Structure 1
């Protein structure tokens, strides 16, 4: 019959980034969806392109916001840490030109 080998695949995490009304040149607001089986997102950091200093995001309600003293340059990098203490890093998840109302997931 239809056997369930989904467990064979092992574990998987689904993360997506969506810009919300309010994005600015020195301030960026994006909604983040993190789904992990038995785990959950605990911390997220955002690093600007051409920059080597990851900046922490503030969890606002159900989204994350980051403010810089200069203009943001894409592609942007975002690192995720699961409450269980797991960490995941996504490079080039959002390009410099982002649109509002469109989702944006991290590429391989």
Structure 2
């Protein structure tokens, strides 16, 4: 029950594009949301291809938290996963 997030080329201060590997024996990923530092909304990531993306009209403020829903109905919340100053091509694990 493991997740890594690698920042993909194409991310910028208003846009994160993430390759997310989600291992959970017998289940698999259905949904992912980001929550910015000190913010109360969960913002869905949209699956584009085999990566996930979320855009903002303002720069995103981190560190960023993430919530997952598996196709099995299992939900996890991981806090402080990725710093504001992320780097493209770096992998991050909660």
Distance 2:21 2:37 in 1: 22
Instruction: Give the alignment's Cα RMSD to 1 decimal.
Output: 0.8
Report Cα offsets for 1:3-30 as digits up to 9, x if no partner. xxxxxxxxxx010000000111211111
Runs of 4+ with deviation above 6 angstroms? none
TM-score (norm 2): 0.95
What is aligned with 1:32? 20
Unpaired segments ≥5 residues, structure 2: none
- Note the residue ranges of structure 1 that are not aligned, 5 or more in a row: 1-12
The structure whose Rg is larger is: 1
Higher relative contact order (CA 8 A, sep 6+): 2
Q: Cα deviations across residues 50-90 of structure 1 (Å, max 9, x unaligned)?
A: 21111000011111100112110110010011101110100
The TM-score with structure 1 as length reference comes to: 0.83
Q: Which has the higher strand share?
A: 2
How many residues were matched structurally? 94
